[PDB]
Structures are given as C-alpha cells and as structure tokens.
C-alpha cells in the first residue's frame, strides 16, 4: 500500500522522477530504499535515505546520476534519475521500514517490511 509512480520508458540519457510515499509514516523516522530487478537478475539495493539521521547513500552504479530529494511532507520521497542508460532497465521497488535506532541504512531485501508493486522503467536507445 506504497504509493509509487513516475516510471514509464525514456531515451537514454533522458531522466525519471520516481515516487514513494508512505501514509503512516509522518510519525516516525524511517528508512525508505529502492531496489530494481531485471529479468533474470537479483533485486539489488539502489540507493536508500536514513530520515533519523538525514542520510542518503547511494551503490556505486547509479553514483552521481541518481540523486534522492525530500518532499515537504515527511513520508513522501523522490528519486531523481538522469543520464539513463539500457542496463537501469527495470522494475524499480520502493521499500519502506519503521526505524527504532536510526543507526544504518539496511542494503538487503528482508530488513524491509513495506513494499509496492514497482514501477517499470524501459531506457531505450
């Protein structure tokens, strides 16, 4: 029950502005992730922010193109992606987990107990 959005296909090069929002989540500090899955891969972890600290960390992949801003309301995050390339074709998850430390932002699937559907992303060229 994640709202995602802002997928869809682009030319590569172009960029995207995925979104997350977590309704109950102006409470609490939380960490919110994206992870991606291509058609026969893993799910790897793309880049996550700690609200507890103000964090944001990011693979090594997607460093300097992908960037995650805060909204004004607090349980709302984007990911801005530019400069696309074919391989960050894929479906793009957003995860979400309540945060009682605030202390890491967790980089694997199980450590996050929201999800949503995804939201597909095609780069062509």
């Known amino acids: ?3 995602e959005s802002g997928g869809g296909s682009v030319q590569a090069g172009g960029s995207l502005r995925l979104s997350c929002t977590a309704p109950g989540y102006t409470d609490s500090n939380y960490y919110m992730s994206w992870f991606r899955q291509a058609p026969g891969k893993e799910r790897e972890w793309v880049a996550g922010v700690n609200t507890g600290r ?4 990011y693979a090594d992949s997607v460093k300097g193109r992908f960037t995650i801003s805060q909204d004004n309301a607090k ?7 530019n400069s696309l390339k074919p391989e960050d074709t894929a479906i793009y998850y957003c995860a979400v987990a309540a945060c009682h430390f605030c202390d890491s932002l967790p980089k694997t699937q199980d450590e996050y107990i929201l ?3 995804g939201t597909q992303v095609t ?3």
């Open 123 to 125: 780069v062509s060229s």
């Open 75 to 81: 349980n709302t995050m984007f990911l801005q992606m």
């Open 115 to 117: 999800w949503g559907q």
């Open 1 to 3: 029950q994640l709202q």
């Open 54 to 57: 103000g964090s944001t960390s």
